[PDB]
Amino acid sequence: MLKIIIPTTMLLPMTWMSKHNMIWINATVHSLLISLISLSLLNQLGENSLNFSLTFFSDSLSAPLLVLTTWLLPLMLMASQSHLSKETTTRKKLYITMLILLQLFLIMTFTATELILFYILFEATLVPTLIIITRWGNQTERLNAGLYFLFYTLAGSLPLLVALVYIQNTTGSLNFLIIHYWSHPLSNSWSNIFMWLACIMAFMVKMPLYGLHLWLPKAHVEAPIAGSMVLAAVLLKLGGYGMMRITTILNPLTNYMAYPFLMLSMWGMIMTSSICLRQTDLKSLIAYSSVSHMALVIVAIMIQTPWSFMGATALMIAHGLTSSMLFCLANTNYERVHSRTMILARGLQTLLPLMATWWLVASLTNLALPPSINLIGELFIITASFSWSNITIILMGMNMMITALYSLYMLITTQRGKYTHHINNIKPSFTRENALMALHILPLLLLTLNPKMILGPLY
Amino acid sequence: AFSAPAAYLTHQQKVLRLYKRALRHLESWCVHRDKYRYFACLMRARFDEHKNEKDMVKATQLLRQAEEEFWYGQHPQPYIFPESPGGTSYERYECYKVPEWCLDDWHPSEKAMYPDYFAKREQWKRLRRESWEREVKQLQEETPPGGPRTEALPPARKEGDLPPLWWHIVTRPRERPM
Amino acid sequence: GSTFVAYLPDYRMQEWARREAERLVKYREANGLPLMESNCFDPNKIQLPEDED
Amino acid sequence: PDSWDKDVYPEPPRRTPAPAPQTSLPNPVTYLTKIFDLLVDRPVTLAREFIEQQHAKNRYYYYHREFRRVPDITECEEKDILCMFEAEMQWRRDYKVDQEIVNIIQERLKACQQREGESYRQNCAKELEQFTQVSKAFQDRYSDLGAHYSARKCLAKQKQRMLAERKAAKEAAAA
Amino acid sequence: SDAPPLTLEAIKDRVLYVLKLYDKIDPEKLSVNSHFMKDLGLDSLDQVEIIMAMEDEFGFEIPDIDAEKLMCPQEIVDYIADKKDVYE
Amino acid sequence: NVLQIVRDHWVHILVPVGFVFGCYLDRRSDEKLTAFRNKSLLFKRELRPNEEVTWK
Amino acid sequence: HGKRLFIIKPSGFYDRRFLKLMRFYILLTGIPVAIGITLVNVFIGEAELADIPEGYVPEHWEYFKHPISR
Ligand SMILES: CCCCCCCCCCCCCCCCC[C@@H](O)O[C@H](CO[C@H](O)CCCCCCCCCCCCCCC)COP(=O)(O)OCC[N+](C)(C)C
Ligand SMILES: CCCCCCCCCCCCCCCCC[C@@H](O)O[C@H](CO[C@H](O)CCCCCCCCCCCCCCC)COP(=O)(O)OCC[N+](C)(C)C
Ligand SMILES: CCCCCCCC/C=C/CCCCCCCC(=O)OC[C@H](COP(=O)(O)OCCN)OC(=O)CCCCCCC/C=C/CCCCCCCC
């Protein structure tokens, strides 16, 4: 596993010893090369796992997430290259350093044979994101957004550390392999109920759950484009990965325990999809769509059936790519308009046709159009929920309809109609932005040819 | 659409507008030309009966009462011209209406084609730059103190002057650009 | 990378499983055995606890 | 074709009728299929022969992997991790094999339903009963394990089922 | 479409045609610049009927605000030319 | 020009050196988990006439 | 008729340039890959299943069918 980690570490001296006008070129090239290196991990077995050593292992749940995390960095660099133009070399190098550290923490988090190491890296990812949000942020509310993002996470995760150390004191090991082979039932007891809550709520807050989703609109709206990309694409999937990893110890307690969460998510997807209909902001709308998708992923994980797990993995990957693309499009609009409100700049299809095509493709893939992997996860989760209960479909049905609505709403408000007469600084779209959208969208349509590559270990 | 609106509508403006709406809706009701002509003349004759009435209160009583009758028999699906705000081709060609300043963003290889057009455009830009600087002062001196009362603009009064705020009225894209 | 992912070797053992099932069914049909058994493990090597209730 | 075994995927002899032209009018189907043969089948056939002689000029073989039998979870100590690992791997392989078996039976059923056409309800009762039996067997072994399934959970399910069966048999005998 | 590019001459010709088929006006007395209220002694209702005829002749309808302040055939032609973007 | 483009392009070599070093470290860490080599019940095999270890 | 009027439209030069560049690079790498795959399939590929000889143990990459996979 070090064949990926060591180049990521070497990214830092290379960036800091780079010539003042060659940081972006060097960083993008080596990030793409590291991504290519990460592709080797995809060739998984139907057997246990790819246990490299005592510290790191690979799994077909971990491999797609690792590949996506590696692939995201060149896109984030290309997106950040624009608005950091009037900035000193030292601070640009610091920004690139923070992105590299975030990638390194995520890579070590996703392998993480041991749960305490997983927790340490899972919370280590918090510092670079907080600094990126609160330092290179435009508005004055970035401080409040950073405070919300930090404290929601820590309030959720502090009981998790106590639960983990207690579990190691009783069982004797926190290793994933040992835990899976030596799993024993949890008696329905008050202490076991609170242990379940402590083990689950930390990953529930980061999805986030409908009750605890407030930090996310603030963090997404106030963060720069790279911050929004990394939050929507990878950082939200940490909770799902943690739940899928930790749920094994929880049974048979999960069935009784799951109802409050199942109801919250099934109603919160409807609530957030409906909130998307009445929004005056692109970034907030994308954030609420992300909340709805992750609520569906929560439902899938809580049902805890094979089809549920495959659907959850596919939906996580597809949502990461789609939400990153949507945030990139919104940022391209914002860098021209400087308002970040949908109703101001209108009729952009007439002025920017190719960018309108990119908008259409992104909205279609957010809409879960078949045979895209978005709908693959959608349908697997829906079928698993129907087997769980024949009434869930009704809610699911509403969700699908509402989703389509706001997606096309976002496509119609900004691209169709008549262009605002006063705005005249809408310059032709650059090659960099078109390349960014192409690199976002091509992997989805390539992955729909090989869905099993992202369907997880239960395939 | 071109002229500025008024602070209100007089009684005669209201009766003329009611006459227009009623005649259009009767034409919608009467598909054939002879039937429409007969009923339109009958309606015109009925309308002219109260023409010399002088009582303002009576005048208010007239037309408003007619408006209720018009609303009752208003032909729920009236005829609308295709390009009218209710027509089937109201905004068909708004997607083809590209602003003029977009030409300022063309690549030089594109501006190599159509050189005479861009030369004339440069002359237009020079004229606009001079005329706007004149127009700012002209409108500042001609506007009434405390702000304008009616959104109508004065014409040019000197020899070399141009109409104030003319650039975006003269440079409309077209009705049917493509 | 797409070409590499497309031509990844069968470490998931799908054709291996297909051939194993083919040979297994070929043998079972001939013997007259009833396909797949209900019990995943042989009952003779499972020692149940006697109730005596 | 020799590429696949005829016994694993049985097929009827496929009797077909003879052309019986009741009229002297030349039908378009025969002339159309002859011109199709001449314009399509021959060039494809010659291309295939060239590719086949190209393949024969270079020849190599690959061998199906064989696996030994390892003691299962019932011959494993309560905390001895090595044998539990081996038994879990063996159980997962057997689970994959059973999935492929059910796939083969479903393929047989679909092929029968399409092949016998309109009388599929009568002429595919054998395949329907075969699939019912294999589905009954498969469902008993793995239906309620869910995610994080394991050999121990399957063994516990089998034990619960077999105690239920033993109690039912004892009660029926002692009824 | 296949619509001929109508010009100012065609517009004015059709305007005067419609006005001459208006029997309330004797054709030999009207002119291009002839007023409606005073030069022809026409009622305001007659003017709005003229607007009706124009709208039914050119296939488009003029807004009431602009229509109610059109008193000459020449200015009507100018307005309709501005609406249709007529070159010559 | 050699000895001049090096002072500006030396940084490029670092990522590949890290990759080869990580591969070497992965093999070296692998070398410490050989306690069960050619001892698994599923793969007990008799060594070839010129073979010392089943895998390296 | 010589009534050719000027059509005002946004500059499509950059979009066409980006599309041409993307096509050029994608083809630049895919055409050699496609040619190589076709040559491998026609000349070398499609190994056929055999039986393991007695006393011989196969290597790990000899259990696959496609030459590129091996
Ligand atoms: C705010 C946004 C969302 C945040 C997250 C919300 C999700 C967390 C909520 C936790 C779900 C329920 C917790 C405990 C459930 C236990 C089952 C119970 O409800 O049912 C009965 C329990 O009866 C009563 O519920 C007893 C508990 C009553 C006291 C709990 C407070 C009720 C409302 C408080 C909600 C506030 C939550 C947030 C706190 C900050 C069953 O009776 P009994 O057989 O006897 O007990 C069985 C359990 N045994 C076997 C261990 C003994
Ligand atoms: C512009 C207008 C169109 C012009 C072009 C016209 C031509 C259109 C053709 C393009 C698509 C049309 C469909 C044709 C499909 C044929 C190719 C297909 O069959 O190959 C697929 C192969 O595709 C790959 O499987 C999927 C692509 C891999 C995706 C990985 C992403 C790339 C890495 C980049 C970073 C990742 C970011 C996201 C993180 C997860 C499926 O292969 P498979 O049936 O299985 O078996 C292959 C043969 N075997 C048995 C020998 C193995
Ligand atoms: C919103 C999250 C959901 C919150 C639901 C409940 C909220 C109200 C609780 C407030 C905090 C209560 C603190 C005290 C709880 C005591 C629980 C307890 O001690 O059980 C420990 C139990 C058994 O104790 P022993 O004595 O060792 O067993 C021997 C005899 N059987 O052992 C454990 O499992 C340790 C695990 C730590 C328990 C976690 C305590 C905190 C509450 C759980 C997390 C839920 C809140 C999460 C906050 C959400 C913010 C994002």
Ligand SMILES: CCCCCCCCCCCC(=O)SCCNC(=O)CCNC(=O)[C@H](O)C(C)(C)COP(=O)(O)O
């Ligand atoms: C098919 C749908 C049915 C619709 C129902 C419609 C009902 C029609 C009956 C309404 C009866 C009336 O006349 S409504 C009675 C309103 N009061 C007056 O008319 C008093 C003074 N009239 C004016 O001032 C006019 O402008 C005039 C002098 C006519 C011209 O003016 P010009 O000289 O400035 O052109």
